[PDB]
């Protein structure tokens, strides 16, 4: 094995494994190789480092997440293999094949056979590394797809000068553990710890931070010192938000990008050599994450009534809403005896009928011989209810081909408690008084 092992920080074992498995000689190279790790574990980075440190190796890079389905992946394999072989050996006359003729895995076998037989004039046998970076990120994935790819090498010719070698990257452990009896060589990429995450963030971000335009305009408005400023900012970001992000390089990069100009704007002539004074000058940046971005009155009260109908049992409604004077002798409801133990708004909503929702809407809506001050259910109320179903603030048991007029169809609220809380605060309705006495 004659190959270069690049120095990749905190991935020395993985780089030594890549040097063990990936070589230009097809006899001592596995037909399939798996890199497995979760998001941001530096799989793509160290494969890039290995192939740039060994430019004599011939690698083809594919992204299955851009191809979604199996047939575009087969067509992409044929197209990129043929284009790479065209630019690798320009002095070899080749018959071009259309990648859109590949519609089956067998058609891919036939097309690769036809592409590879016009290169037998080459002297040495040669690996062509086809890298499927993100195989399990394919959107139409099923369990039978990977078996075709790992048995694909047995159908290609054995004495060919060009020998395809598959390198896959996988995200999830369970998908990989589906195929464990195939005994494919695997290199695992465990998640970084917080010190490795901080070192990677410093060595990847301090150069871009210390030649940022905001810092360079701030120092003329008010190199190693700027490096220490950016590194101290990165360490403060890590210690403030490592519990929030976990060991996530991307999320911490986004937080650094959001909070760096607001940190730079608080830098004065007194703050540069005093990191503590600069930290108390910008304390509000390190206390909250800050990663975030007109309904009608009838629609608001219908949403409030639907939330009540979803999260209150209908046997007790007469013990809350009934207020009329009884000409006829009649006993109102006694009310609920025992409180609930679990807050019912933590659970999924219950389903109700239309007339119950209209009853509670009439009971909670704001207001003599010929007045009848209660609002009856006219067409504007039903139009607002239909729009509320259109926006999915309310929902039904059926999602497609809905019989709105069916008595079998029942309705539920589809908003969380914070949304109905802000809505009730917009119309000064005390919705929290309706749930205070029940648990």
């Amino acid at each position: 094995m004659n190959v270069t092992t690049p120095e990749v920080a905190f991935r020395e074992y993985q780089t030594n494994c890549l040097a063990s498995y990936i070589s230009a000689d097809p006899d001592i190279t596995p037909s399939n190789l798996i890199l497995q790790g979760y998001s941001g574990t530096g799989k793509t980075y160290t494969l890039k480092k290995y192939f740039n440190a060994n430019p004599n190796l011939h690698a083809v890079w594919l992204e299955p997440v851009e191809l979604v389905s199996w047939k575009p992946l087969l067509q992409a394999i044929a197209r990129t293999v043929q284009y790479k072989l065209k630019t690798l050996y320009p002095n070899i006359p080749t018959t071009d094949y259309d990648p859109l003729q590949v519609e089956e895995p067998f058609l891919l076998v036939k097309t690769l056979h036809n592409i590879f037989v016009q290169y037998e004039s080459l002297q040495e046998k040669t690996c062509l590394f086809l890298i499927l970076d993100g195989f399990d990120s394919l959107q139409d994935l099923d369990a039978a797809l990977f078996n075709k790819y790992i048995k694909l090498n047995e159908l290609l010719p054995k004495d060919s000068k060009i020998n395809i070698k598959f390198i896959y990257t996988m995200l999830e452990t369970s998908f990989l553990q589906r195929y464990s009896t195939h005994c494919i060589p695997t290199v695992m990429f465990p998640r970084y710890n917080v010190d490795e995450v901080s070192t990677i963030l410093v060595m990847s971000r301090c150069g871009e931070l210390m030649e940022d335009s905001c810092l360079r305009k701030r120092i003329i408005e008010e190199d190693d010192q700027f490096q220490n400023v950016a590194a101290n900012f990165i360490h403060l970001i890590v210690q403030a938000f490592h519990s929030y992000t976990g060991n996530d390089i991307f999320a911490l990069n986004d937080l650094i990008d959001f909070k760096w100009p607001k940190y730079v704007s608080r830098i004065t002539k007194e703050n540069i050599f005093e990191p503590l004074a600069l930290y108390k000058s910008a304390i509000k940046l390190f206390l909250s994450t800050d990663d975030n971005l007109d309904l009608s009155i009838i629609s608001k009260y219908l949403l409030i009534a639907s939330y009540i109908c979803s999260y209150l049992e209908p046997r007790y409604d007469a013990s809350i809403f009934s207020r009329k004077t009884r000409i006829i002798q009649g006993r109102a409801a006694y009310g609920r005896r025992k409180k609930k133990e679990v807050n019912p708004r933590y659970l999924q909503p219950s389903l109700f009928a239309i007339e119950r929702l209209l009853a509670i809407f009439q009971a909670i809506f704001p207001i003599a011989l010929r007045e009848e001050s209660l609002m009856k259910a006219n067409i504007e109320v039903f139009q607002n209810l239909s729009e509320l179903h259109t926006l999915k603030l309310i929902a039904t048991t059926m999602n497609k081909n809905i019989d709105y007029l069916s008595p079998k169809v029942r309705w539920k609220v589809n908003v969380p408690w914070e949304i109905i809380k802000e809505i009730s605060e917009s119309v000064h309705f005390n919705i929290s008084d309706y749930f205070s006495d029940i648990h």
């Binding site: 030594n16 790790g37 979760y38 005994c183 060589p185 695992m188 929030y244 976990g246 659970l347």
Partner: protein, 106 residues
């Protein structure tokens, strides 16, 4: 010897020669000279490093990568699921259990 110990362990767990070959190949390939190869085959310490790496992304190894807040949310969800009859839970119940543990600790 260490080689016979690793072969015995494979015999009682995997009983697969390709599984053993996949570990032996980077033991040979990462050796830089003949003395390093003889030391590597006498000690078989690279087989232990390989075995540790093959288990690094499982449920045990993924747990040790979690932050303290992630571990707290996972513990709260687990005890809510253990208290449930069907083992089901959501974000609200797990958050309620989490704030009960934070005020009980504080």
């Amino acid at each position: 010897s260490n080689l016979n110990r690793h072969i015995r362990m494979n015999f009682e767990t995997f009983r697969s020669l390709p599984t053993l070959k996949n570990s032996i190949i980077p033991l040979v390939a990462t050796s830089k000279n003949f003395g390093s190869l003889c030391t590597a085959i006498k000690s078989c310490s690279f087989l232990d490093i390989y075995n540790k790496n093959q288990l690094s992304n499982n449920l045990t190894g993924r747990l040790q990568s979690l932050s303290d807040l992630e571990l707290a949310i996972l513990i709260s969800a687990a005890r809510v699921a253990l208290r449930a009859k069907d083992g089901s839970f959501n974000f609200n119940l797990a958050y309620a259990e989490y704030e009960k543990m934070i005020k009980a600790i504080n």
